[PDB]
Design a protein around this nucleic acid. Structure first.
Length: 258
DNA sequence: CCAGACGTTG
DNA sequence: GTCTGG
DNA sequence: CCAGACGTTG
DNA sequence: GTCTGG
C-alpha cells in the first residue's frame, strides 16, 4: 500500500472517470490543479496522484454527488502541522488503518469534516516477503479487466481504474503558499486472494455505488461511509520485474508480466 | 492543569 | 487543533 | 513501498 | 538499525 501506477494521459484518465450524478446526468469530473497531474508507472509517497472528491468541498451549494478530480500529495499533512516544509512530518500518513480511524487525531478530524476522497490508480504494487530469502517479489494488483501497439492502446482505452478510499486534509504553509491538499489511503486486512502476498491491502471501493457514497459527505455520514471500508476478493494480480522497486524507474516494464 | 503526541509497515 | 498521559 | 544515506570542517 | 528521498 506504498506504491501505485497512474500513467494514463490526463484526457484518457478523465474519460475513465465518466460517472452519473444522483439525477442520472452522465458527467466527466471537473479538474482543479491539472498542471500538477504527473503521469507515472511508479507513484511513491510524496508524489501527487489524481483523486476524486465531492464538488461540495469546492463550490458552495453544489450537488454533492458531482465530482472534482485534483492532484493531491500522497502522505496526509494535518492542518495543525507547524513546520514550514511538509516532508518534515515525523509520522507515516501514507496509510490509515480502517480499524483505528475513529481514534487517530490525524485522520478523524478531516474525516469528520467529510474529507473523503477516491485515490485513482491503474493498480497498486505489493512486495511479497518469501520464507528464508530477503529477496521480495513485487506484484501489480488491479480490478479484473475486460477479456500490438494498437492492442495495448485499446486495453488502456478500456482500463478499469482502481478506486481506493482515502481521506485528505488541507494545510496552509505557515511561511505562505497554496493550500496543500494531501491524502492517505485507508488500509484493511488483505482478502484471502491477496493473503499470501501481504496481510494488508488498500480499502478498495468496488463500483460507482461505493465510490458515490464514499464521495458524498452531503448525504452519507462517516458511520455509513465506514461500512464501505473492508477487503475485496474482486481483484487480480501478476508478478512483475524488480524494475518497479526503484521509484525513479518510470517505464511500462514496472507493471509488465515477468 | 500542562506537555507532548499526533503513524504505518514489517 | 485536539487528544492522551502524567 | 524500496533504495540509499547515515558527517564535519573549512 | 532508522531515517529521508523518490
Amino acid at each position: 500500500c506504498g506504491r501505485t501506477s497512474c500513467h494514463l494521459p490526463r484526457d484518457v484518465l478523465t474519460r475513465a472517470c465518466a460517472y452519473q450524478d444522483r439525477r442520472g446526468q452522465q458527467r466527466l469530473p471537473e479538474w482543479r490543479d491539472p498542471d500538477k497531474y504527473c503521469p507515472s508507472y511508479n507513484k511513491s509517497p510524496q508524489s501527487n496522484s489524481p483523486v476524486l472528491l465531492s464538488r461540495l468541498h469546492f463550490e458552495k451549494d453544489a450537488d454533492s454527488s458531482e465530482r472534482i478530480i485534483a492532484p493531491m500529495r500522497w502522505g496526509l499533512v494535518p492542518s495543525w502541522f507547524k513546520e514550514s516544509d511538509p516532508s518534515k512530518l515525523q509520522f507515516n500518513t501514507t496509510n490509515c488503518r480502517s480499524d483505528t480511524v475513529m481514534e487517530k487525531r490525524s485522520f478523524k478530524v478531516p474525516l469528520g469534516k467529510g474529507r473523503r476522497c477516491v485515490v485513482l490508480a491503474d493498480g497498486f504494487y505489493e512486495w511479497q516477503r518469501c520464507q528464508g530469502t530477503n529477496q521480495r517479489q513485487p506484484y501489480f494488483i488491479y480490478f479484473p479487466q475486460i477479456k500490438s501497439p494498437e492492442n495495448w492502446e485499446k486495453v488502456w482505452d478500456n482500463w478499469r481504474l482502481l478506486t481506493m478510499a482515502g481521506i485528505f486534509d488541507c494545510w496552509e504553509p505557515p511561511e505562505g503558499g497554496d493550500v496543500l491538499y494531501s491524502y492517505t489511503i485507508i488500509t484493511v486486512d488483505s482478502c484471502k486472494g491477496l493473503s499470501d502476498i501481504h496481510h494488508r491491502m488498500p480499502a478498495i471501493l468496488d463500483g460507482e455505488e461505493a465510490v458515490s457514497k464514499w464521495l458524498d459527505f452531503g448525504e452519507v455520514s462517516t458511520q455509513e461511509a465506514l461500512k464501505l471500508i473492508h477487503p475485496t476478493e474482486n481483484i487480480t494480480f501478476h508478478a512483475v520485474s524488480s524494475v518497479v522497486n526503484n521509484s525513479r524507474n518510470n517505464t511500462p516494464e514496472c507493471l509488465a508480466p515477468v
